[PDB]
Structure 1
Amino acid sequence: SAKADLEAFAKECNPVVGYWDPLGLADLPLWGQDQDAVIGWLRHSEIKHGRIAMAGFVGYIAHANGFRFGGIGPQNVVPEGASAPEVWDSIPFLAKLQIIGAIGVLEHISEDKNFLAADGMKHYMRGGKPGYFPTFSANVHPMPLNLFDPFKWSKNASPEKKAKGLVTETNNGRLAMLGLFGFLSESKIPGSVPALSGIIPSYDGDYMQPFLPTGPDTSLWTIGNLWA
């Protein structure tokens, strides 16, 4: 049973706490689908949230402390000394659009039947591995590197080690979620995360609005900027 697998996974994550579902979301019938499909959805959502939160935390240290690529690019319109909430606000509108669009294409490839079937897998709600990004083996143009393990460092890793790695992924993703929203919360309700008192600056602007402020409308292309 998918619930039994989830409870065992929770025990692996933390045997002191074990399975901790105070709302019974694992028993909620999302979309009227059975418990196995709903648990697949919830595990995929947990892993996805955790992954993106870990990337968000590392990128918060990168942007706020000051870590930029050189050359012509979106980096040249963000003011120096800008804080992590102003970096996204300051990049060009096309940069925001194309970042979100590329993330969307990756989501689409993640849930497409074509790639998951070419990799001999199924959708995470239809008896598949929750949190599996397929190789780009069904994209039209042959694609150099895959998303997960692009250099294939885990081509020969034990299944037990992979299971432990997924157990690590869930826990570290949860903790990264807590830290990243600690950073966000300290800027819109000061004195909420006591350690960050005085570190994170206040930010006047809706975090959850992606395209506000719209940012500059510059044209950063140089050679062949006929569209300007």
Structure 2
Amino acid sequence: FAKELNPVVGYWDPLNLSNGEFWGDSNSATIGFLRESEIKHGRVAMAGFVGYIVHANDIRFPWDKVAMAAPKGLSPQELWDVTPEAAKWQIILTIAFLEFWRENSYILSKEGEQHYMRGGKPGYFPTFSELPHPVPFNLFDPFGFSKNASPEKKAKGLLAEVNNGRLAMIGLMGFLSEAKVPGSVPALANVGIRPYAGEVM
């Protein structure tokens, strides 16, 4: 593998996680699990950085905004903490269903392979052709744009996704830290914790 990415920086694992036996399993599936975890963390961090950029300014959706434009517009995080419990619960449940669909090795075997104990290219959301729903389009490329593409372009995009995911992980961590302790940049608002809060306990 050797993870070309940045040619000057080869490997880099003080923690020797690469030659590991996570949950008493083989090394290859361990490397696959770490690759899937870092790719998912990168994707989530990129989405969170774009969401924080869009929520710092009042850019709420003007479609109806019955509850979106209700409060005012505050601590980017608070924005989340002000929203009702049903909204965040449905968001969490939809993410849980999407990741349950991602790991389903019957649909995956109909499409590709799973990350551990198989080939399983790290990061592959399967299609929506098996659940009892003619959904308009799948999660990966809903509006068909990359239907026909070169494999070399796909590999370059995967490397770019990994690198930009690490960069935006650093960026989102920096923004979240500057929300509570100003490291190196101005233009923060306040600290709005991290968990759900607002109700339950």
The question of a shared fold, defined as TM-score above 0.5 by the shorter chain, is answered with yes
Matched to 2:199, the amino acid is T
RMSD: 1.5
Q: Which runs of 5+ in 1 are unaligned?
A: 216-228
Q: Which runs of 4+ in 1 moved over 4 A?
A: none
Q: Secondary structure at the match of 1:206?
A: coil
Whole-Å Cα distance in 2 between the matches of residues 165 and 110 of structure 1?
A: 20
Matched with 1:200 is 188
**In the TM superposition, what are the counterparts of 1:176-191 in structure 2 within 5 Å?**
176-188=168-180, 190-191=181-182
Matched with 1:218 is none
For normalisation by structure 1, the TM-score amounts to: 0.82
Is this contact kept in 2: 1:13–1:167, CA < 8 A?
yes
Matched to 1:94, the amino acid is A
Name which one, 1 or 2, has greater alpha-carbon Rg.
1
Matched to 1:172, the amino acid is N
Of the three residues 68, 74, 82, the one matched with 1:75 is 68
Q: Which runs of 5+ in 2 are unaligned?
A: none
Matched to 1:27, the amino acid is N
Determine which structure has greater relative contact order: mean sequence separation of CA pairs < 8 Å that are 6+ residues apart, divided by chain length. Answer: 2
Residue 73 of structure 1 and its aligned partner are, at CA, apart by 4.1
For normalisation by structure 2, the TM-score amounts to: 0.93
% same residue: 54
Whole-Å Cα distance in 2 between the matches of residues 19 and 49 of structure 1?
A: 19
Matched with 1:168 is 160
1:122 matched to 2:118? The reply is: no
1:143-192, Cα deviation, whole Å (9 max, x unpaired):
2111111122111111111001000000000110111111110122x232
Deviates more, 1:168-177 or 1:152-161: 152-161
**Cα distance, 1:206–1:191 mapped onto 2, change above 3 Å:** closer
**Cα distance, 1:30–1:73 mapped onto 2, change above 3 Å:** farther
Whole-Å Cα distance in 1 between the matches of residues 107 and 144 of structure 2?
A: 18
Of the three residues 61, 76, 79, the one matched with 1:84 is 76
Count of matched residue pairs? 198
**Cα distance, 1:114–1:144 mapped onto 2, change above 3 Å:** farther
Whole-Å Cα distance in 2 between the matches of residues 114 and 75 of structure 1?
A: 38
Is this contact kept in 2: 1:74–1:95, CA < 8 A?
no
